[PDB]
Enzyme design. Structure first.
Site, mmCIF file in Angstrom:
data_model
loop_
_atom_site.group_PDB
_atom_site.id
_atom_site.type_symbol
_atom_site.label_atom_id
_atom_site.label_comp_id
_atom_site.label_asym_id
_atom_site.label_seq_id
_atom_site.Cartn_x
_atom_site.Cartn_y
_atom_site.Cartn_z
ATOM 1 N N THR A 237 -46.894 -4.255 9.315
ATOM 2 C CA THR A 237 -46.646 -5.295 8.316
ATOM 3 C C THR A 237 -45.154 -5.497 8.075
ATOM 4 O O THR A 237 -44.629 -6.602 8.236
ATOM 5 N N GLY B 274 -52.438 0.727 -1.572
ATOM 6 C CA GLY B 274 -52.163 -0.131 -0.444
ATOM 7 C C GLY B 274 -53.110 -1.303 -0.430
ATOM 8 O O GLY B 274 -54.187 -1.266 -1.023
ATOM 9 N N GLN B 275 -52.674 -2.390 0.202
ATOM 10 C CA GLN B 275 -53.577 -3.516 0.392
ATOM 11 C C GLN B 275 -54.719 -3.127 1.310
ATOM 12 O O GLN B 275 -55.890 -3.439 1.036
ATOM 13 N N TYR C 289 -59.671 -6.224 7.136
ATOM 14 C CA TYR C 289 -59.490 -4.809 6.825
ATOM 15 C C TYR C 289 -60.717 -4.207 6.161
ATOM 16 O O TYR C 289 -60.955 -3.012 6.302
ATOM 17 N N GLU D 270 -63.136 25.891 -0.460
ATOM 18 C CA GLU D 270 -63.582 26.625 0.710
ATOM 19 C C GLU D 270 -63.193 25.911 2.002
ATOM 20 O O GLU D 270 -63.065 26.554 3.049
ATOM 21 N N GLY E 99 -44.766 0.680 2.154
ATOM 22 C CA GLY E 99 -44.030 0.054 1.075
ATOM 23 C C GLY E 99 -43.922 0.992 -0.102
ATOM 24 O O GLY E 99 -44.363 2.141 -0.048
ATOM 25 N N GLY E 100 -43.332 0.475 -1.182
ATOM 26 C CA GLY E 100 -43.226 1.193 -2.447
ATOM 27 C C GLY E 100 -44.520 1.266 -3.229
ATOM 28 O O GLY E 100 -44.573 1.940 -4.265
ATOM 29 N N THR E 101 -45.549 0.557 -2.765
ATOM 30 C CA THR E 101 -46.914 0.853 -3.172
ATOM 31 C C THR E 101 -47.289 2.286 -2.795
ATOM 32 O O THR E 101 -47.904 3.007 -3.588
ATOM 33 N N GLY E 102 -46.874 2.732 -1.608
ATOM 34 C CA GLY E 102 -47.357 3.980 -1.050
ATOM 35 C C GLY E 102 -46.472 5.206 -1.090
ATOM 36 O O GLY E 102 -46.947 6.303 -1.381
#
Lengths: 440, 427, 71, 49, 426
Positions: free
Chosen positions: E170, E10-11, E215, E245, E134-137
């Site tokens: 976004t 992601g950006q 960000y 654990e 997005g398709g990044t994620g």
């Protein structure tokens, strides 16, 4: 005192040999005069050139090579190259006119006139040998002096010599790319004369070498300098158990005992595991176990056949460098536990290992870097059956419409050898089908 | 050590050869009077393939020149390179042919053919290990087409297994430049389809299309057009003239690209061609050559191969280039255009590389393509021939001096079968 | 050195002498007539290539008795 | 000692061989220039006639 | 021999990547040639002679943000083969990310991860982050989840997801991929938690005076969250607890796992002049809900499960006095069946300090975790504002045209409603 004559045929044979005799001279101290350099050497005491050289009364050495061609131009460059002073001036046997992509011309008409000269000259290096082991044919499958003229050596070298272990290194025509359109006629008609007459037959297509260069290395756009430098490493690693001492000495005889199940099954594959760029070599460890599981991959096998199709029949390993005989027996622990790599049912042990001390050199201007560990893995797979089924479908599209045959008929060749050779490789292709079937 | 004997035929044949020896000489580096003065010895180590040697380094081109009209034979003796051919080899005719083919074949063709054979066997005895013969002519005239067909008919008595090429000038489809041309052209091919092991096809208006479109030269004379085709006929015979990485001489180009012995009619083109406008602009890499040779626009025989299919093609690559680049860029012409390539041959292309380029360039290449587009050419002349035979137009200039009318109808059957031969192999 | 600065075909005027590329491992090469196989035997020696111990392969004691007779 | 003494007459025979080929090349080019002078004289007398 | 793999998708994820990897590059001092000027052996792997390689992946489906990574300072500190790029941009499209484009490099990514699996002997967790936006994620991470699970099954794969805010976003057809990802994160990951972090907008100027951030100023604190979670594994402590654990204690119901709390002293130098920091006092500051990093409220919710990460000058006396004194007061409502509500992890080494961030140098620090039902109201608000677009069918054709159906759209929502029906009783 373990001599090993290498005889090269054709344009592939010469240009592999130029890369091959670059490396052999560079391992020892042979500079292109043939004289080892004078550093006021008191002892000397090196007898590692004796497999591939002969010492004269002067400081010179002569190689064992018999360079043969019917095409005079490519043998003319080794005549006036920087290796002009190295080869004995008669060992560069040339032809008189080229063969030009005809198996019939290469075996019947224009290839028969030269051959009465070469087979005298093989005797002139045979008598000099004392304990000669076996030859090394370097040849191709596309052209006339690679496909037909080598078919005529094997029918006369077998009856003249017999019990010498002949090995070869062909260049199989690719399933998809090609240079010539007549080559599937050559590549079926050359099997019938090399099925019976070659003892062990390594075989490497020029697609995975064309693929591994663009993918493992950070290089694109290679030529035949970069292909034949890679093949020239394999020929050195197989023979190196004869040249330098190690823990387990696998000479040229003991390969064919441990690698061939049946006498009609003698077509193994070949790989080279730590091939890497010198920009890339120092980033990653090249351990003993990192060069075996990264050698049993399907992406780095030098022929375009996928070994997840057939099942493995016999495997042989040739380590080189600083390798202890322990960690080659723990790398096998990782391989045999997996389910991806199936061995055939009637072969429980299925391995043959070998260690040798001296690490590989690099040629100056060479793509592959220096290492500490290196291994060449010769395996015998069932999945080589599909490298012919992709070929004979390009042979029936030839012959059932009966194209390009009018060249082959008038040379001295009849039509009966076409339909005989097609069924002959169809006899071989069925034999791989039966050994992979599990016996209960 | 293996060499080619050049031999020309006709006013078009002589004018081609005067600009073929004009362009092979100073690529070997030869002055206008015949003494080698070039830079490197690599061009000298096999200079004998197209040249011959004499006293004191005075080199002699070994071409055999014949023409029937002496008024244009002297035009090449007065040229800049006219003083290198030895004047024993000029075989002049005392009277012209008159553009009837059988005069060049029977009446005044047979009168000189004893003399033209006298100089070649005198020369071929002096040859060491001869390889092939090389011929240029036009089909359109009795001086060129008639003389050559009598030579090639009975040169197969004496030299049967010598690899013969002929570089014809096929008549243009729009305007043929002689009225009684197609009698000569249809009668020429019957001596061509059985004798010559290879033959090429250079349309005269397809070279005009190149100066129309690609080069866009303003004022092209025949000196310019002969230079555009002479480079093509240098590219074929080159891999035996220089070393290479994967060489291919005339025998390897022949036995690897014709499928059947009466199917050998070729179609050439030469790759790097650029105008003065675009030369500052143009890219120079290896896929930029695959644009040129496989453009149907850059093709020096008229018919576009979209109407038919290739059988086998050839591509020799003069230059110092990467082998993979050629091999990678040859399948990617087969894949995006697989409808113009037949199916009972797996791969079509023929590969050849030679290290030494033409003098100055980085890379250059020559394309020779055996196509079924040429049946659309050969269908034209056969229709054109029938329009003048049935009404017996211009008959008596051939009947009363030579063979009878059967030879025309036999030549129809030698012509009609070939057009049916191409079509049967088209699908 | 031109056929015609604009001949019916291509032409180029240049000094082949300068049309040469030298090699740090070797010498300059007439690029106009650049050797396609120039690289063949075109390098400069470096003991750097030399790996570790020269420890080689030989068997004199073999001949010592082998070259000779026996019991 | 003997293994050393082989290399010296090796080098000496190759040196004298290169010398005699250079002498042969010299006399051949003197021949060629003599011939060229003769043909120039021939061209002159033909033009005078 | 206690490996963890980290992911910057992601950006917003690479604006973590600056921060999270700056703090990983100052926990042990890492030069950008990989030679130091055996606690690092989670991340790194020594080469032949002298170079170290981080096995952490920036997995983005456009080459632009990847070439910004390479033109950053840390050129050879990050080895470029691990980092995933794609020649054609996916651009929100789950279809192009999942089926069509990703299938040609999926064998490459799996070749890479089975190449470093030989180094991966004692792996404690595949830590994953991703945004949903997005398709990044969404898609290519999802397909990695299924294919890695059918390649091993057992190994630890964990995920601490990123989620869209209710107010701002976004892309705004992004709830499609958020619903799809809530359906597909339940299958093949051990864990999926809270880097949803809308409230870091609130925190970065509420507490540390840096108005006008990026960000990156937020994502310093996201990296500091990462440090507190995995630092107990990375360094020896009094009562250290590793990630396997962790996984054997964190998850009450095997499809019900989503908490909410913060790293506690998110305090600058301006407040750090005066605030005498104690473990009790910083957790007193922490237990207030308004300084969360999940936009929700457990003051009016039920404080069900908990965890605690302690760093620095921590004493069992201090932590237990704080536990007692805040366990007394019912200003925090406690939960029904679970009596106590604390679990502890202790770290010797205090966390490192990176310049160019919000924070300041600390002697010690505390955190918490408070897994409640306060994500039920947030998924109810996402239920409140997703159906507006699936009533009148926005943007479906772009998804549909390359290899999918409306069936996955009509299945994922009902699976999410099944998870809400898991959540509504406890």
């Amino acid at each position: 005192m373990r001599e090993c004559i290498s005889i090269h045929v054709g344009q592939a044979g010469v240009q592999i040999g130029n890369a091959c005799w670059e490396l052999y001279c560079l391992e020892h101290g042979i500079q292109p005069d043939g004289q080892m350099p004078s550093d006021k050497t008191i002892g000397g005491g090196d007898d590692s050139f004796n497999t591939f050289f002969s010492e004269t009364g002067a400081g010179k050495h002569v190689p064992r090579a018999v360079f043969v061609d019917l095409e005079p131009t490519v043998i003319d460059e080794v005549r006036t190259g920087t290796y002009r002073q190295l080869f004995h001036p008669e060992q560069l046997i040339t032809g008189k006119e080229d063969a030009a992509n005809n198996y019939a011309r290469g075996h019947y008409t224009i290839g028969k006139e030269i051959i009465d000269l070469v087979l005298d000259r093989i005797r002139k290096l045979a008598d000099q040998c004392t304990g000669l082991q076996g030859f090394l044919v370097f040849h191709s499958f596309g052209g006339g002096t690679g496909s037909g003229f080598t078919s005529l050596l094997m029918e006369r070298l077998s009856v003249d010599y017999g019990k010498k272990s002949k090995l070869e290194f062909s260049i199989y025509p690719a399933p998809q790319v090609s240079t010539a359109v007549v080559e599937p006629y050559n590549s079926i008609l050359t099997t019938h004369t090399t099925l019976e007459h070659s003892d062990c037959a390594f075989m490497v297509d020029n697609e995975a070498i064309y693929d591994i260069c663009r993918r493992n290395l950070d290089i694109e756009r290679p030529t035949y300098t970069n292909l034949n430098r890679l093949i020239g490493q394999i020929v050195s690693s197989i023979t190196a158990s004869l040249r330098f001492d190690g823990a387990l000495n696998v000479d040229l005889t003991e390969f064919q005992t441990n690698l061939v199940p049946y006498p009609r099954i003698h077509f193994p594959l070949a790989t080279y595991a730590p091939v890497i760029s010198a920009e890339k070599a120092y980033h990653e460890q090249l351990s003993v176990a990192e060069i075996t599981n990264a050698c049993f991959e399907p992406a780095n096998q030098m022929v375009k056949c996928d070994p997840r199709h057939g099942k493995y029949m016999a495997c042989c390993l040739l380590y080189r460098g600083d390798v202890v005989p322990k960690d080659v027996n723990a790398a096998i622990a990782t391989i045999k536990t997996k389910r991806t790599i199936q061995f055939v049912d009637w072969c429980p042990t299925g391995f043959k290992v070998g260690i040798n001390y001296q690490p590989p050199t690099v040629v100056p201007g060479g793509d592959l870097a220096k290492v500490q560990r290196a291994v060449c893995m010769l395996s015998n797979t069932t999945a080589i059956a599909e490298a012919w089924a992709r070929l004979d479908h390009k042979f029936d599209l030839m012959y059932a419409k009966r194209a390009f045959v009018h060249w082959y008929v008038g040379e001295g060749m009849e039509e009966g050898e076409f339909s005989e050779a097609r069924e002959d490789m169809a006899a071989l292709e069925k034999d791989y089908e039966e050994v992979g079937v599990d016996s209960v | 050590m293996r060499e080619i004997v050049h031999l020309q035929a006709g006013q078009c044949g002589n004018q081609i050869g005067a600009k073929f020896w004009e362009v092979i000489s100073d690529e070997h580096g030869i002055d206008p009077t015949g003494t080698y003065h070039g830079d490197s010895d690599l061009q000298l180590e096999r200079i004998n393939v197209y040249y011959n040697e004499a006293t004191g380094g005075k080199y002699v081109p070994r071409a055999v020149l014949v023409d029937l009209e002496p008024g244009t034979m002297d035009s090449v003796r007065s040229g800049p390179f006219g003083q290198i051919f030895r004047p024993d080899n000029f075989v002049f005719g005392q009277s012209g042919a008159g553009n009837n083919w059988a005069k060049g074949h029977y009446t005044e063709g047979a009168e000189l053919v004893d003399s033209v054979l006298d100089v070649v066997r005198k020369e071929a005895e002096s040859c060491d290990c001869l390889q092939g013969f090389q011929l240029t002519h036009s089909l359109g005239g009795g001086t060129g087409s008639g003389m050559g067909t009598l030579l090639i008919s009975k040169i197969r008595e004496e030299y049967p297994d010598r690899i013969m090429n002929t570089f014809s000038v096929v008549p243009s489809p729009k305007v043929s430049d002689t009225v009684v041309e197609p009698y000569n052209a249809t009668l020429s091919v019957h001596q061509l389809v059985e004798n010559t092991d290879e033959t090429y096809c250079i349309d005269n208006e397809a070279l005009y299309d190149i100066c129309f479109r690609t080069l866009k030269l303003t004022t092209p004379t025949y000196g310019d057009l002969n230079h555009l085709v002479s480079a093509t006929m240098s590219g074929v015979t080159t891999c035996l003239r220089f070393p290479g990485q994967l060489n291919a001489d005339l025998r390897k180009l022949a036995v690897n690209m014709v499928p059947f012995p009466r199917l050998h009619f070729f179609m050439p083109g030469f790759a790097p061609l650029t105008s003065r406008g675009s030369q500052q602009y143009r890219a120079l890499t290896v896929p930029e050559l695959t644009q040129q040779m496989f453009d149907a626009k850059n093709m020096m025989a008229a018919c576009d191969p979209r109407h038919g299919r290739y059988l086998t093609v050839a591509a020799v690559f003069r230059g110092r280039m990467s082998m993979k680049e050629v091999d990678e860029q040859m399948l990617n012409v087969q894949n995006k255009n697989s409808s113009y390539f037949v199916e009972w041959i797996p791969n079509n292309v023929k590969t050849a590389v030679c290290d030494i380029p033409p003098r100055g360039l980085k890379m250059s290449a020559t394309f020779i393509g055996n196509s079924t587009a040429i049946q659309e050419l050969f269908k034209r002349i056969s229709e054109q021939f029938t329009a003048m035979f049935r009404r017996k137009a211009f008959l008596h200039w051939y009947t009363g001096e030579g063979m009878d009318e059967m030879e025309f109808t036999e030549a129809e059957s030698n012509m009609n079968d070939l057009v049916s031969e191409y079509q049967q192999y088209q699908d | 050195p031109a056929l015609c600065v604009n001949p019916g075909n291509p032409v180029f005027s240049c000094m082949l002498d300068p049309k040469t590329l030298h090699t740090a491992t070797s010498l300059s090469k007439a690029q106009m007539i650049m050797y396609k196989t120039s690289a063949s035997q075109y390098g400069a020696f470096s003991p750097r290539p030399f790996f570790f111990p020269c420890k080689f392969l030989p068997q004199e004691q073999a001949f010592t008795e082998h070259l000779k007779t026996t019991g | 000692r003997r293994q050393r003494e082989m290399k010296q007459d090796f080098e000496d025979q190759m040196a004298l061989k290169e010398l005699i080929l250079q002498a042969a090349k010299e006399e051949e080019e003197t021949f060629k220039k003599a011939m060229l002078a003769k043909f120039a004289e021939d061209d002159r007398i033909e033009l005078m006639n």
